[PDB]
């Protein structure tokens, strides 16, 4: 009520979208609010790629507050690549606006089949300045530097399909969203919202592991070796050459992920990382986990984690707040 | 799946 609140909706009960506009005239767009990137892009009227056929497009000519740039840009993600150029206009998030530098995408061929298979228009990064391309100060930071918000921090309360809507709260924390106390973990770097925690699954542990809280990732990312040791005696079936892991949803051997610090302990049991795949077979589930190796052993805590845990992203205090999310609002 | 920057 006192801070900016953007309503969130789930997408195929895994990911979630939020809306925001560009230009002095509204011009709405559906975004993937990605704490794992630091750039903002939107499909341009100038787009020529097939993937833009179903999307809302941005038209600078119809915006008085438009400021041209033109410097070609290539935004790279783990899942794909999108091309275009830089531009600047009024970005309206929730109910606050600000002149912001963003990317006008015109080529989305490197982001298929994801882009055409999804209903979002663009991506709105919520990471750190250094993660951006073209030295762009985060939206929440800029907003704070302009006395538009009390604190430079945003909150995420993911939505549950047929249960409740979600919220991206900017500026302040609201107890309506979480239960119990909040616990903060300091960032180990000002790039992604990356913190350090011990990763313990079974008798397998990886201490001082790099954990990235990323709303832009649909799954739980685990280092390859860690995953393999993890699925050893379990009764999971990895379809040959595919990151497709199937099990009986009631499989009594399924472990609980346990991330710890001297401040708190965060767990993620089966019900949070399993996806029903009943259409495939009765009583069947898939792990929604992915083996992914980075320079430094990293765990990506995506939507599955954020779905169980209300999260606070503090730019001013360079830390992440974690608390148990409310079952219902 | 989707894994969001380089």
> Number of helical segments of chain A?
5
The largest sheet of chain A has its strands arranged as 2-3-8-4-7-6
Q: How does the major sheet of chain A shape up?
A: 6 strands, mixed, barrel
Q: Fill in the CATH topology of the largest domain in chain A.
A: Cathepsin D, subunit A, domain 1
Helix % of chain A is under 10%
Strand content bin of chain A: 35-45%
CATH superfamily of the largest domain in chain A: Acid Proteases
H/E series of chain A: EEEEEEEHEHEEEEEEHEEEEHEEEEHEE
Tell me the greatest interface: A-B, 30 and 6 residues
Query: Structural class of the secondary structure composition of chain A?
Result: mainly beta
PDB class: hydrolase/hydrolase inhibitor
Keywords: malaria, drug, aspartic protease, plasmepsin, glycoprotein, hydrolase-hydrolase inhibitor complex
Assembly: dimeric
Entry title: plasmepsin II-pepstatin A complex
Give short descriptive properties of this protein.
heterodimer, A: 329 residues, mainly beta, Cathepsin D, subunit A, domain 1, 2 domains, 6-stranded mixed beta barrel, 4-stranded antiparallel sheet, 24 strands, 9% helix
Describe this structure in words.
The complex is a heterodimer of chains A (329) and B (6). By secondary structure, chain A is mainly beta. Chain A has two domains: 1-175, Acid Proteases (Cathepsin D, subunit A, domain 1), CATH 2.40.70; 176-329, Acid Proteases (Cathepsin D, subunit A, domain 1), CATH 2.40.70.10. In chain A, 9% of the residues lie in helices and 45% in strands. In chain A, the strands form two sheets. Chain A has a six-stranded mixed beta barrel with strand order 2-3-8-4-7-6. A four-stranded antiparallel beta sheet of chain A has the order 15-16-20-19. Chain A is globular and about 60 Å long. Classes of the chains: A mainly beta (329). The A-B interface holds A 15, 32, 34-39, 75-79, 81, 114, 123, 125, 127, 131, 214-219, 221, 290, 292, 300, 302 and B 1-6. The PDB classes it as hydrolase/hydrolase inhibitor. The entry lists the keywords malaria, drug, aspartic protease, plasmepsin, glycoprotein, hydrolase-hydrolase inhibitor complex. The assembly is dimeric. The entry is titled "plasmepsin II-pepstatin A complex".
């Amino acid at each position: 009520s006192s801070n900016d609140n953007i309503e969130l909706v789930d997408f195929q009960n895994i990911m979630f979208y939020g809306d925001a506009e560009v230009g002095d005239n509204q011009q709405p767009f559906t975004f993937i609010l990605d704490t794992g990137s630091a750039n903002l892009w939107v499909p341009s009227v100038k787009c020529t790629t097939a993937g833009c056929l179903t999307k809302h497009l941005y038209d600078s000519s119809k915006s008085r507050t438009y400021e041209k740039d033109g410097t070609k840009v290539e935004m790279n993600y783990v899942s794909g690549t999108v091309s275009g150029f830089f531009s600047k206009d009024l970005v309206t998030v929730g109910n606050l606006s600000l002149p912001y530098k963003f990317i006008e995408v015109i080529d989305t061929n490197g982001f298929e089949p994801t882009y055409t298979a999804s209903t979002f228009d663009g991506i709105l990064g919520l990471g750190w300045k250094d993660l951006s391309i073209g030295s762009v100060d985060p939206i929440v930071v800029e907003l704070k530097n302009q006395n538009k918000i009390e604190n430079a921090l945003f909150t995420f309360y993911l939505p549950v399909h047929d249960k409740h809507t979600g919220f991206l709260t900017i500026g302040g924390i609201e107890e309506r969203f979480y239960e119990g106390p909040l616990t903060y973990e300091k960032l180990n770097h000002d790039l992604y919202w990356q913190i350090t925690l011990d990763a313990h699954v079974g008798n397998i542990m990886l201490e001082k592991a790099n954990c990235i809280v990323d709303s832009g990732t649909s799954a739980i990312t685990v280092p390859t070796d860690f995953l393999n040791k993890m699925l050893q005696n379990l009764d999971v079936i990895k379809v040959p050459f595919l990151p497709f892991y199937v099990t009986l949803c009631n499989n009594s051997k399924l472990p609980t992920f346990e991330f710890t610090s001297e401040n708190g302990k965060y767990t993620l049991e089966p019900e949070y990382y399993l996806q029903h795949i009943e259409d495939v077979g009765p009583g069947l589930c898939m792990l929604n986990i992915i083996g992914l190796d980075f320079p430094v052993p990293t765990f990506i805590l995506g939507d599955p984690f954020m779905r169980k845990y209300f999260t606070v992203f503090d730019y001013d205090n360079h830390s992440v707040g974690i608390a148990l999310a409310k079952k219902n609002l | 799946x989707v894994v969001x920057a380089x």
